[model samples]
Target chain A: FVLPPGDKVKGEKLFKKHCKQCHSIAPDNSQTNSGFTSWGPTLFNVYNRTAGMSKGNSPFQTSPDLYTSGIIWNDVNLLKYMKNPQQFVESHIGMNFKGLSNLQERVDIVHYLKTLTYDDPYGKQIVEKYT
Target chain B: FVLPPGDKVKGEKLFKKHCKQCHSIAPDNSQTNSGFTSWGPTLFNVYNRTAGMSKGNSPFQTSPDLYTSGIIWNDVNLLKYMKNPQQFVESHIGMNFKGLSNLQERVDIVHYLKTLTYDDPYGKQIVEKYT
Candidate 1:
């Protein structure tokens, strides 16, 4: 089922409440002091990015299994992954978060994430399609 | 002494090596799942921001001591803080970092931080003045 129109304000609040510890929306990837110690990848422009490929130099690049899985970041996939990360990619071992079960919270997070992009074509299409 | 022109690429690498675990450049502040649990505030647009005033609702909003102390985030001040957080804000209890000692690395980080801004005027001026 398609998500109801999400709220950016509410979504941001929820995202900070739940996701900020490990996930960031910053796009810098030059950090390499600790491999696998930084937790999750930045969610910036995540709507248009390919899953498992957060940055060029990141060791946490999406698993080949996830890469071959062809999981592009989009409304539908993010919803699924957020609800149950392990279920989305069993081999995805980095995140220790339990998924968000509430449908509304998930929708709001997607809306907040959508605002993190600039002119991402794929993300724009998703916003148009869903919102 | 003024910092040499900062390098975003090198700054990013150094930041990742030294600061990613506790600091970020993301702007979302909705994260309240843990008070003082998240290591530090997002560094986005930090150049224009006042020191210790990371977010409006943050429990860690600049201490009255810091606020009254009149610390603003800028290249010169950041250099001092990065070199020694304790020296910058003796009461700043949140960060446990030892501070970066390399002058070049600190300069690079400030340059990298400037890139995290959208239309930060202060940051732009810093870039022009330093770079």
Candidate 2:
């Protein structure tokens, strides 16, 4: 696998531990105010959508520069960056994750990320009526 | 920039269109039930944390294989995957984002993702007292 394998079981724990403070990976978007960060990316359809495709290219055309030039999401890259983000990207970005020193721990987290998805059956109705 | 560049403004729009239904980028994690997909990765602190380090490895040490062997989060990879997902990873994982054909769109999304951060001052108090 070119990407990091995630463990839903482990991912849940890791997500709650480090991620819950800032983000949420629940498939439902109906609930707001889930984390500390007022604006983190959603993990829903992450597996379903491509990297750059998550959001469209309207405001930041320079995204390619950062993704291709800045960091890579491969297993090695993930490991390298996780171990030390400053090493992967420049100091401008404010991510403080130093990468998990343990190898197996990282794998489990990745595995869990894979399972992130949206599964709201009534989402369409809500979007149509309100949003 | 070590990682990809992002656009907070564009990110907000894209997030609302594609991600809002399933996720929220607000600095609060108190509300629940957001989008179509009930479970996806959160984009907040995503820039802050490492890939494998995002989730711990008590369950899946195999994450490295997926990340290293499967896909990379570089700009090029982001572009390629945004255009299409099957091209990046195997069919096992379930992502549908077919790479943002428009580079600018993807960048905007990435840019917005970068803006994701934890700002809930009451989160700690709530976590300690409630969760």
lDDT of 1 by residue, B1-131 (tens): 54444445445455554444444434433211111212344444445345542322223244443423244665555655555444454344233233333333333332333333324553345335523
DockQ, all models: 0.03, 0.03
Contacts from the true interface found in each model, as a fraction, amount to 0.00, 0.00
Q: Can you give the lDDT of residue B42 in candidate 1?
A: 43
Clashing pairs for model 1 are A16-B31, A31-B16, A52-A62, B52-B62
Off by over 4 Å in 2: A1-7, A28-38, A47-74, A91-131, B1-131
Q: How do all models score by TM-score?
A: 0.30, 0.24
* Candidate 1 lDDT over residue span A51-99, tens digit each: 5423222332324343233346655556555555545544443322233
Model 1 interface CAPRI class: incorrect
Query: How far out, in Å, is residue A77 in model 1?
Result: 0.7
**Tens-digit lDDT track for model 2 on A1-131?**
34323344444444444434324443333323222222244433233233322222222233444432322233343334334434443332322222233333333333222222222223333333432
